[PDB]
């Protein structure tokens, strides 16, 4: 989706604030060519478009679209790429049309669009051209979203935008229910091993596959193993087949990322509950079950990279070595012969990565410390102890070691003698507060990781996975999760429809040959032509039970459940079932920041905040207005003075905290006096009285 992407702004294009809110909206010419759904939620609406499925580029530089052409009520297969300009003159028919076996219409009266785009209803005489399909207004990532036609387009914009931010897991079970896109998606993605030549398998490995082509020659295929992303995710690849298989050109041999069995997978199938419970689902709060963390089913992979070099200075050169200034040896016994640490060390924050040391120069010391150095009998050296250490809240093993040097023929920019890189990976458990969502735009964070026993559970006693709250339903208009709840439990359950004498009217048309299901099934519904509502109620009417004769889920799709806390059954049947969920990338180490005392700017005395900095917390304006609204002015005098800009106070209040003495009075903000000097620079007798 970074590709196929339509952008408005840029060089040779408009200015962002200087373009009005009229180019942003859609026009009826946008139909069939650019999906109106996929756009970022922030200040880019109308600026970033998304290219649809069946579009194609004009050699002149425009969008061309195929359409089926009908002559005299006979629809041909004559595929004609068309532009919107000639489309204005012409007659575009309807996708879901009562078409009878030739291209012939049952009805004579058909909905149609004019060149204005107004929806008119016409007799079946003028129609030259017909739609090829449904989903023509739909982009690619839009097309993986089932039951779109039953929920809000705004929520569709939300969760549609959310699915690009999914993370890979380590298991990759296929989703229980999808559409005809996911198998069709990854085969053009090119992260998955596609069979180039139709041959037979000769011999595989864990890391390579040596194939046997039918005509003579062979070929090996090195799969990539644990490659680092641009964001630090896992790009491991893995074989799925055996060593002697007659394969065909185009087939899947091995998959890499989130895909499985030829199709994408953003998570797992889980058992869902729809009750509100003890405020732990309070306004989109989400809870979990204990089994998943212990069965590790949501485990993530994160690779973080560090890099530093050895350079030259005016005095001399930087040094990478095992020789350190004054330091412990416990912090050295995991390092190699020549500085850097060895393979497979587990670090904590503050540990030393690369031994880096530079010369000082020739300075003087205090006589008191020079005395102590005579007392402890150790002059150190004329160098500086400035080595590479790990940033904070970080752990994990180091896998790869990459290292360059100027004297060793390595091309690298000037002033530099030597380079090194570090790759640090880490298994991370799922914990509280992380960003979880379902496909229908519903989302939220993890409040409480429960034990396994305080949990809703069946008459057969099977514990539930998550519980969702009621009130996300009405006002956000997102009942498609309920739809796939019923259909999902139909899939886990399985059926065999007992119409041995006569098919019911819900199932009288849809396909044939479908009226059974072996459970743990593999099903799909397309975008606009999937199931219908009485059919959904119809599949619930067959209820192939787990072990014994047991209708746990009634004809209204609810179950009777027990208290997992005190024990008694609940006095109402509860909507429950299965839902396919997913996990995103906003972990708690990412957005955490904290600081008592650190680095500051050189221009101002303000704290500086970046990646390797602790971060600083930007305090605004209306905040100060509300501080005035309390009138807690001593707080304000604390904030803007001893915490912001006055250097000479910071040592005083910090040292007072050290001794536990009184809080000193906040002195004059010296940053204020800087303005006065600027006024005195410009012919101003300014004065205080």
């Amino acid at each position: 989706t970074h590709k196929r992407r339509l952008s408005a702004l840029g060089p040779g294009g408009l200015s962002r604030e200087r373009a009005g809110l009229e180019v942003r909206d859609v026009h009826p010419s946008h139909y069939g060519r650019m999906c109106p759904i996929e756009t970022p939620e922030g200040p880019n609406i109308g600026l970033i478009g998304s290219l649809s499925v069946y579009a194609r580029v004009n050699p002149f530089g425009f969008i061309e679209t195929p359409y089926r052409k009908v002559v005299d009520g006979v629809v041909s297969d004559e595929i004609v790429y068309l532009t919107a300009d000639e489309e204005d003159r012409h007659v575009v028919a309807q996708a879901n049309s009562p078409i009878d076996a030739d291209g012939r219409f049952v009805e004579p009266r058909v909905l149609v669009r004019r060149k204005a785009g107004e929806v008119e209803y016409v007799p079946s005489s003028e129609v030259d051209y017909m739609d090829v399909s449904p989903r023509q207004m739909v982009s690619v990532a839009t097309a993986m979203i089932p039951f779109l036609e039953h929920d809000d387009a705004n929520r569709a914009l939300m969760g549609a935008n959310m699915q690009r931010q999914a993370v890979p897991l380590v298991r990759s079970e296929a989703p229980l229910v999808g559409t005809g896109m996911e198998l069709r998606a990854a085969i053009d993605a090119g992260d998955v091993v596609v069979a180039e030549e139709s041959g037979v398998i000769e011999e595989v490995s864990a890391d390579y596959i040596t194939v046997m082509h039918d005509n003579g020659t062979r070929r090996t295929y090195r799969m990539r193993k644990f490659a680092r992303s641009n964001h630090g995710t896992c790009a491991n690849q893995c074989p799925i087949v055996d060593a002697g298989d007659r394969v065909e050109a185009g087939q899947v041999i091995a998959d890499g990322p989130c895909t499985d069995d030829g199709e994408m997978a953003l998570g797992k199938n889980l058992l869902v509950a729809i009750m509100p419970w003890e405020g732990h689902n309070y306004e989109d709060a989400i809870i979990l079950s204990n089994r998943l963390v212990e069965e590790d089913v949501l485990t993530s992979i994160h690779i973080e990279e560090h890099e530093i070099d050895a350079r030259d200075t005016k005095l001399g050169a930087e040094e990478i070595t095992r020789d350190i200034p004054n330091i412990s040896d416990e912090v050295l016994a995991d390092l190699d012969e020549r500085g850097i640490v060895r393979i497979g060390a587990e670090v904590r924050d503050g540990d030393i990565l690369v031994g880096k040391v530079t010369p000082k120069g020739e300075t003087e010391l205090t006589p008191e410390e020079r005395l102590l150095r005579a007392i402890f009998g150790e002059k150190a050296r004329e160098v500086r102890d400035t080595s590479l250490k790990v940033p904070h809240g970080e752990s994990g093993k180091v896998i790869g070691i990459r290292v360059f040097s100027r004297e060793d023929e390595d091309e690298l920019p000037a002033g530099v003698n030597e380079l090194v890189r570090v790759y640090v990976a880490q298994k991370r458990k799922i914990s509280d507060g992380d960003k979880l969502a379902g496909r229908h735009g519903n989302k939220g964070v993890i409040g409480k990781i429960l034990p396994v026993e305080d949990m809703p559970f069946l008459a057969d006693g099977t514990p539930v996975d998550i519980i969702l709250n009621t009130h996300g339903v009405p006002r956000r208009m997102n009942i498609g999760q309920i739809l796939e709840t019923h259909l999902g439990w139909c899939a886990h359950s399985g059926w065999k429809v007992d119409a041995a004498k006569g098919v019911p009217d819900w199932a009288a048309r849809l396909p044939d040959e479908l009226l059974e299901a072996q459970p743990n099934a593999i099903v799909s519904t397309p975008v606009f032509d999937g199931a219908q509502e009485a059919e959904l109620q119809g599949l619930l009417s067959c209820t192939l039970p787990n072990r014994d004769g047991d209708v746990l889920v009634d004809a209204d799709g609810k179950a009777m459940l027990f208290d997992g806390r005190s024990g008694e059954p609940f006095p109402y049947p509860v909507t429950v079932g299965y839902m396919y969920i997913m996990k995103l990338h906003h972990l708690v180490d990412d957005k955490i920041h904290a600081r008592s005392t650190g680095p500051y700017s050189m221009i101002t005395q303000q704290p500086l905040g970046g990646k390797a900095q602790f971060g600083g917390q930007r305090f605004g304006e209306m905040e100060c207005w509300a501080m005035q609204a309390y009138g807690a002015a001593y707080t304000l005098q604390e904030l803007l003075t001893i915490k912001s800009d006055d250097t000479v106070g910071r040592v005083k209040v910090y040292e007072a905290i050290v001794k536990g003495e009184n809080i000193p009075e906040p002195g004059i903000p010296e940053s204020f006096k800087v303005l006065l000097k600027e006024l005195q620079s410009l012919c101003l007798n300014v004065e205080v009285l």
Partner: peptide, 27 residues
Amino acid sequence: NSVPGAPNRVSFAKLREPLEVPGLLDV
């Protein structure tokens, strides 16, 4: 459906599709 190593997945397509999806990287 025109895919060699495809697993079976049952659908609710009432219609057919006369034209297949084109290649996505062709843009």
